Design a protein around this ligand. Structure first.
Ligand SMILES: *[C@@H]1O[C@H](CO)[C@@H](O[C@@H]2O[C@H](CO)[C@@H](O)[C@H](O)[C@H]2NC(C)=O)[C@H](O)[C@H]1NC(C)=O
Ligand SMILES: *[C@@H]1O[C@H](CO)[C@@H](O[C@@H]2O[C@H](CO)[C@@H](O)[C@H](O)[C@H]2NC(C)=O)[C@H](O)[C@H]1NC(C)=O
Lengths: 306, 306
């Protein structure tokens, strides 16, 4: 399992301490939202797989100038030969007109990587579950109209480069939108006795439903060979309805034990990253400040066996 | 929210006055059942979105001749450059053998719109909730055998053109059909909790159930990417059981406050049109003459905030 190393806080431990926590807890992969020099210098030579992101504010530059892309790769990838880079995630939940820069930026970063002999590092992007117009039933999975406009080209690029699509999937957020619309147990991996039939397949949790819905949506744009990586998933420990340490532990521990089995339509391990390592005090007040597995003081918010 | 501007009456205010009422009340969209000249002249330059219909009696002509369709578009659409046209609704609850002319007519109108540089105006059709063979539970939603025959091609045409399907949904009529079959509160938006449990999903009102049933039916015909627009919905203020100003206000005010959040399986705003602006004295005696938000003299039948 992997863990997202969010840094929107002013009281987190230093990078080398965090890298050490990953190692002592058995966390194999780390997702960074930007090429933080401290984190990259510290994670090198530790064996931890790294997903490094190109933040949304640099997308325009990477799309507009392939030279800028080669420079980005040189300064943030080639500069750290000891780091086990796995993917370069270009953008995170890019929206609006900025989506037009997505494919061009990915193409330019991809070209720069291959040229440096670093072509084993796959280029992808991370999308929100909100781009799904239909998630239930999974067999009818489709992207919304707006999303379909840019997702078509994105999915086709991933298919031709043999790169996976990254998706931030949060059963908690789908449920919290309207608590009366579905049983909480369905979103929490606690829906005993509940089997929602979709043709020949039976679903027991919202995570599987959403993952399979994404796969169906991708298949409609020529992406039947594209794998899905869950780049974010978690449950808040406070700040909102059902956001408690007990529910967060239940969700995350069940998630960890579940991803190796896969979904009804897609058996097999699903690469997953839990959001997030620490509670981040500089995010919005409410659930947003309570997504951490650890408190800034390094104490577990709740027990977890990775 | 939008409002249907029905004209089956002999004592309604002039079109320019009606348009003034739309503005002063905050009604953003208007549905016309025919390209009424007085109305189209009066609504131009107001910003009010317009759904214009091609009445059932002109369907065979539009289907048989591309030239007739181009002429219809020229006289009723191109002739009003100041009108904010949103959709062209070809037919309203077309039934029997006339349904064979549906797709041909839509194709011809669509072709004419594109050639004129008005391809942004989507072509659709409006169907009755009566074409649903099963509406409960929503996961089992499906069209009647007869409806399925023509709905397949209709939904497929809509999917290919990125146009929505319009549906006239009336919880009142479904309930009034057999009052013992369901609690009136369920139809009126006054149920306390979950009335229908569908797998992990909970429905507390008939409106949501019907909308989701339509989505399921469409998905079964290749229309999982097709959005639904509620082209009509309301509650009568007199002329029948439970038809009172208090119940009509309750239903309509709750609908207005509800549609922005969507349904259990389709969260998000649902484009909705309330039937209707005025009570229409040339309709059948009973509930049919009491669907209005306003009396012909322009007084509110009941207080409403849009
Ligand atoms: C997982 O689901 C079970 C079964 O619904 C939950 O256990 C019930 O919890 C309620 C709490 O009010 C009790 O009244 C019931 O008696 C419990 N059922 C049984 C069989 O003991 C359990 O709380 C859920 N777990 C989590 C973490 O939400
Ligand atoms: C909406 O539902 C409420 C609650 O069921 C109705 O109010 C109750 O009506 C009964 C009459 O049978 C009274 O005895 C209760 O005291 C009322 N409860 C409350 C809290 O007021 C209400 O009448 C319904 N509204 C509509 C328009 O049907």
């Amino acid at each position: 399992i992997g863990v997202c190393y969010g840094m929107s806080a002013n009281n987190l431990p230093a990078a080398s301490t965090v890298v050490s926590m990953f190692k002592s807890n058995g966390i194999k992969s780390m997702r960074l939202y930007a090429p933080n020099q401290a984190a990259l210098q510290a994670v090198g030579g530790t064996g931890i797989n790294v997903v490094v992101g190109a933040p949304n504010d640099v997308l325009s530059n990477l799309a507009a100038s392939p030279a800028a892309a080669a420079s980005w790769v040189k300064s943030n990838i080639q500069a750290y030969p000891k780091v086990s880079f796995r993917y370069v995630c270009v953008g995170n939940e890019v929206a609006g007109g900025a989506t037009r820069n997505l494919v061009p930026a990915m193409k330019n970063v991809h070209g720069a990587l291959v040229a440096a002999g670093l072509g084993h590092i796959k280029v992808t992007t991370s999308v929100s579950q909100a781009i799904l117009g239909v998630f239930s039933p999974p067999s009818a999975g489709s992207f919304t109209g707006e999303a379909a406009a840019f997702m078509g080209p994105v999915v086709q690029f991933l298919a031709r480069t043999n790169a996976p699509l990254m998706a931030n999937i949060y059963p908690y957020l789908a449920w919290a939108y309207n608590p009366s619309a579905m049983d909480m147990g369905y979103a929490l991996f606690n829906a005993s006795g509940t089997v929602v039939r979709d043709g020949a397949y039976g679903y027991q949790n919202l995570f599987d439903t959403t993952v399979d819905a994404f796969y169906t949506a991708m298949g409609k744009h020529g992406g039947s060979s594209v794998k899905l990586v869950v780049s974010e998933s978690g449950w808040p420990s406070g700040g909102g309805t059902a956001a408690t340490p007990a529910n967060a532990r239940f969700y995350n521990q069940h998630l960890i034990n579940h991803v190796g089995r896969g979904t009804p339509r897609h058996p097999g391990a699903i690469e997953t990253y839990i959001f997030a390592m620490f509670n981040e005090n500089q995010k919005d007040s409410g659930v947003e400040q309570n997504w951490g597995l650890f408190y800034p003081n390094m104490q577990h918010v709740y027990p977890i066996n990775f």
